C-alpha cells in the first residue's frame, strides 16, 4: 500500500477531469516507431479526449490498430457496480496491462503497459512488439479505413494474480468493404500490494470516433471515446 495519508486513494482520484499522458514504443516486423498522446479523462462520464502523434515520422501500421493499446480506469462504473471497478482500485500505484492481439490471417501484437499516476497525471507507458505480419497484408500494407466501431469488452476476475482477465474482438474495416478481425487476450495485475476490487463477470461498452486535426501536419490521430460498465442488473 501507500502513505495512509495519501490525499486521494483509488476512486477518489477520478472524481474530476484528469490529464492523461500516453507513451508508446513499438516494433512491428522490425519497423520501429514511437507515439505520444495527451488529453484528459472524465470518469464520471466515461469520457476520453486524446490526441496522439507519431514522434518518429510516419506510423508503419494503421492508427486504428493501436486504439486498444493506447486507460480503462476512466470507465464510467454505475453506482450499483462500483464494487467491481478493479482499474480505479489499483490506483495510484497502478496496474500492468498485458495483451496478445491476434490479427486474423496475419500477425500478432504483444503489448505490456504500466498505467499509474505520476502526480496529477494518469500515465500509460507501453511497449508493443509485432511479429509474423504480411508485408502486403492489411496492416503493413495500410489497407484499413481510418475509422472505428463500438465494442463490448468482457471482464472476469483472475484471483490467482489478484487481477483480471479480459477478452474481446475488434473488427477493423478494410478498404474493400471487408473486415479485419483482431482477437484480444488481456490480463491486468496490480503494481501495488494493497487490496483491489476483484469483479464479478461484466463488460465495458465502448464508442469511439477517430478524426484529424486540420492544423496538424505530423502523423496523428484525434480520439474521442466513451466507456461505460454494464452487465450487472
Ligand atoms: Br490509418
Ligand atoms: Br480505455
Ligand atoms: Br470513426
Ligand atoms: Br458479461
- The CATH number that applies at residue 166 is 2.40.155.10
155 C-alpha vs ligand 4 centroid, how far in Å? 7
71 C-alpha vs ligand 2 centroid, how far in Å? 4
146 C-alpha vs ligand 4 centroid, how far in Å? 29
Q: Which domain holds residue 27?
A: 1-233
209-217: long-range contacts, CB 8 A cutoff, minimum separation 24: 209/148, 210/63, 210/64, 210/67, 210/146, 210/147, 210/148, 213/51, 216/51, 216/53
222 C-alpha vs ligand 3 centroid, how far in Å? 10
Structural domains in the chain (count): 1
In 3D space, the residue among 17, 121, 115 whose CA is nearest the CA of residue 73 turns out to be 115
In 3D space, the residue among 64, 26, 213 whose CA is nearest the CA of residue 151 turns out to be 64
Q: Which ligand is nearest to the CA of 39?
A: 2
CA pair distance 68, 128, nearest whole angstrom = 12
Quote the distance between the C-alpha of residue 131 and its chain's center.
Answer: 20
Q: Which ligand is nearest to the CA of 221?
A: 1
199 C-alpha vs ligand 1 centroid, how far in Å? 35
Which experimental technique did the depositors report for determining this structure? X-ray
CA pair distance 189, 9, nearest whole angstrom = 18
Q: What is the resolution of this structure in A?
A: 1.8
The C-alpha cell that represents 36 in the structure block = 505520444
CA pair distance 69, 127, nearest whole angstrom = 9
Amino acid at each position: 500500500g501507500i502513505d495512509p495519508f495519501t490525499v486521494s486513494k483509488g476512486e477518489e482520484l477520478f472524481t474530476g477531469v484528469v490529464p492523461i499522458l500516453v507513451e508508446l514504443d513499438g516494433d512491428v516486423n522490425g519497423h520501429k516507431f514511437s507515439v505520444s498522446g495527451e488529453g484528459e479523462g472524465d470518469a464520471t462520464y466515461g469520457k476520453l479526449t486524446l490526441k496522439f502523434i507519431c514522434t518518429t515520422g510516419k506510423l508503419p501500421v494503421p492508427w486504428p490498430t493501436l486504439v486498444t493499446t493506447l486507460v480503462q480506469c476512466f470507465s464510467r462504473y454505475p453506482d450499483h457496480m462500483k464494487q467491481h471497478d478493479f482499474f480505479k482500485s489499483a490506483m495510484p500505484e497502478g496496474y500492468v496491462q498485458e495483451r496478445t492481439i491476434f490479427f486474423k490471417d496475419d500477425g500478432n501484437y504483444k503489448t505490456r503497459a504500466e498505467v499509474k499516476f505520476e502526480g496529477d497525471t494518469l500515465v500509460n507507458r507501453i511497449e508493443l512488439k509485432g511479429i509474423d505480419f504480411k508485408e502486403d497484408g492489411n496492416i503493413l500494407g495500410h489497407k484499413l479505413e481510418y475509422n472505428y466501431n463500438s465494442h463490448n469488452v468482457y471482464i472476469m476476475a483472475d484471483k490467482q494474480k489478484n487481477g483480471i482477465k479480459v477478452n474481446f474482438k475488434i473488427r477493423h474495416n478494410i478498404e474493400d468493404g471487408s473486415v479485419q478481425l483482431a482477437d484480444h487476450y488481456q490480463q491486468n495485475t496490480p503494481i501495488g500490494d494493497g487490496p483491489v476490487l476483484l469483479p464479478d463477470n461484466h463488460y465495458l461498452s465502448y464508442q469511439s470516433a477517430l478524426s484529424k486535426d486540420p492544423n496538424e501536419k505530423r502523423d496523428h490521430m484525434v480520439l474521442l471515446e466513451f466507456v461505460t460498465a454494464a452487465g450487472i442488473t
